[PDB]
Each structure stands twice: as structure tokens, then as C-alpha cells.
Amino acid sequence: PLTRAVLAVVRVRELLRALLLLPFSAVGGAVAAWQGLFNSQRYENFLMSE
């Protein structure tokens, strides 16, 4: 009961710690999506057609 109480405390504080950095990780994920579009084979096909 006690150790899972300490785990519940670390889980709530993990909720807070995850949310406080949410804009930073949001911009990070947007950048990851952006640079993921531009190394496919689809982008190569586009470049060759152009």
C-alpha cells in the first residue's frame, strides 16, 4: 500500500512534469514531422518530376 502510494505521488508529479514542457515537445514533434516529409521516396519522385 505504501510503495504504490509513493508511485502514485511520482505519477501525479509526472503528469505535472509532462505538461509543463508540453509547448517545447509540441514544437519538437512538429519539427520532427516537418523533417520527416523530406526524406521519403515520394519527395524524390517529386524532385525528379520537377
Binding site: 515520394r42 519522385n45 517529386f46 525528379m48 518530376s49
Partner: protein
């Protein structure tokens, strides 16, 4: 008939130079887009028959 010498049974219509390049080889007649790079029919032909892809590119471009 105008023809003084020679006149077939169907009158000769003076065809002129074409004024536009033909649709490529990759396009269809409809509105749906082409295929990004390679057409689909290319898979049902002999490898030594699919040279018409790059030949068509050369013809339309140069």
C-alpha cells in the same frame, strides 16, 4: 472537284503542322491524377519493351 490531274474519291483536306505536344504517356484522359513516377501498365510488359517511358520524355522535352 478542283483537281485538274488527280482526284481520289474522298477530297484531300490539307493537314497542317501540329500545334501542341501530345499527352505524355503517363496521363489518362480523365481528371484523376497520373502516377508520381511510373505507370501501372509498365508491369505487364517485357523489360525490353518499356523503353517507351524515357523515349517519350525525350520526345516531349527535347
Amino acid at each position: 472537284t478542283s483537281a485538274p490531274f488527280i482526284s481520289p474519291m474522298t477530297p484531300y483536306v490539307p493537314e497542317e503542322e501540329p500545334t501542341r505536344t501530345p499527352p505524355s504517356i503517363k496521363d489518362t484522359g480523365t481528371l484523376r491524377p497520373a502516377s508520381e513516377w511510373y505507370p501501372q501498365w509498365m508491369q505487364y510488359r517485357r523489360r525490353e519493351d518499356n523503353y517507351v517511358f524515357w523515349q517519350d520524355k525525350f520526345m516531349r522535352c527535347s
